[PDB]
Task: structure prediction
Amino acid sequence: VGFYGKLAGRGDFVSRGLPNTFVEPWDAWLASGMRASQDELGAAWLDAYLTSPLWRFAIAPGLLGGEAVTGVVMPSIDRVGRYFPLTVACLLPANADLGGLVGGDDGWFEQVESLLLSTLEPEAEVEAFEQAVAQLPAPPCGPRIEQSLISGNLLRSEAVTPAQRLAALAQHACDGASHWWGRGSARISAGLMRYQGLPPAPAFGRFLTGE
Amino acid sequence: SVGFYGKLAGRGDFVSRGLPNTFVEPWDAWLASGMRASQDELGAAWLDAYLTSPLWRFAIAPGLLGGEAVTGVVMPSIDRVGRYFPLTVACLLPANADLGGLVGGDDGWFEQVESLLLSTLEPEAEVEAFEQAVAQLPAPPCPRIEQSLINLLRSEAVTPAQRLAALAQHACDGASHWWGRGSARISAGLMRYQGLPPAPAFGRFLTGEGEVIPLFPGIP
Result:
C-alpha cells in the first residue's frame, strides 16, 4: 500500500509506495477529470467537491499499468489552498480476484477511509499518515479462477461448483473495467458504478454531484 | 413454463412443446449450422464424438435468440428412424431475469432436467411421460439488481452481496454460458461465448478440442 495526492499539511504533491507506472496515468486521469468537472460545474464546483463521497475502487490490469489496483480516493487540498484528491492504493497481481474484492468484506476499505479522513484534522501529522499507510496490509484478495482462451473466442474457466461459477463470472465482469462504490453522501446515494476503461474526463463530475 | 424441442428415439419427426417459435426458429438454425460445421470439420470422426459428448447446461442472454433469456440443458439425440439432432429442454425467462445467480446458483433444477433428458435414452420410455414431466417442471430459481445508465453502468447495490450479484449478472449480458459434468473426453467446467457460439465452434462441445492459451493459473 502507498498513497498519492495532496494533503493539507503539505504544499506539494506527496507520494509514497507507488511506482510511476501507476502514479503517472492516475495523476493524468485525475487532473483531466478535475479540469473537466471545473469547466462543467463552474461556480457550483467547489461546494460539490468539498461535500462529495470517498470512492472505493477496483481497476483492472492494463488500465493503470500491468497490475490491478484497488484503493480509496478522497477530495483533498494542499497547504496553500490548491485542490486535488488524496488516494491510498494497493497494486495487485494481474490474476487478482477483483470480483471477490468488490463483492467482498468492507473492512479493508473502511480502514483506508478512516486513514484518509484523519488527514483532515488540523492537528494531523503527515508522517503519522505516511506510517499508517506504510504499515497497512493489502486487502484479502486471492487468485481468480483458472481460465484459458480457446481458439480465439472461448473463455474456459475451471469452475465446477455453483460458488466457483459465480466467482468466475464476477471476476470476468471486472476485466477491462473500473468499479467505483461507497457510502455516497447527502447528494449521492451509495451504489456501484462501472466504466469500461477509466471514466472519461467529462464523467468525472458524477463523482461529485448526483441526481 | 418449461418446454422442449428437438429429436427423441420414440418419435420419427421433430418434436416441440411449450416453446414459442421466437425461440425455436433461431435455436434450430443455430443447432443446424453447428451440426453441419462440426460434421464438415470432423468427417468420419463426427459420430463417435457426438454420441459420447456431454450434456450442456446453458444460460443465454436476451436477444441472442428471441427477446427472452433462455436457460436449459441440451443433449445429443436421435429420432425413431435413426437421424441425429440434439434434444433440448428450455425455460424462457423475462429479458430482465438474473442469469448470474442461475449460472452461479443451485444445480438442482439442471440435474432434474438432465435426468429427464437421460430418461429418453431408455428402451423404452414413454414419450407421453417425458412431455408430462417437462410440462410439470417448475421454472428455475433465478430478477437482476436494479441498474441504469449515464458508458456508465450504475447498479443499485449497497452491500457486498448485492455488488457480487451485480457483477455476475453483468458477465452474462450479451453472452452464452455453457457448463456441466463433462465426459470421459471433456473436463467439467464452464464456457463463455460473446454471443452464440459461432458454427465452427460447435465442434468444441463434442470434442473439447482447441488451441488453448493459458490466461490465469490454478492454485496448488
Notes: The CA atoms of residues 102 and 141 of chain B lie 7 Å apart.
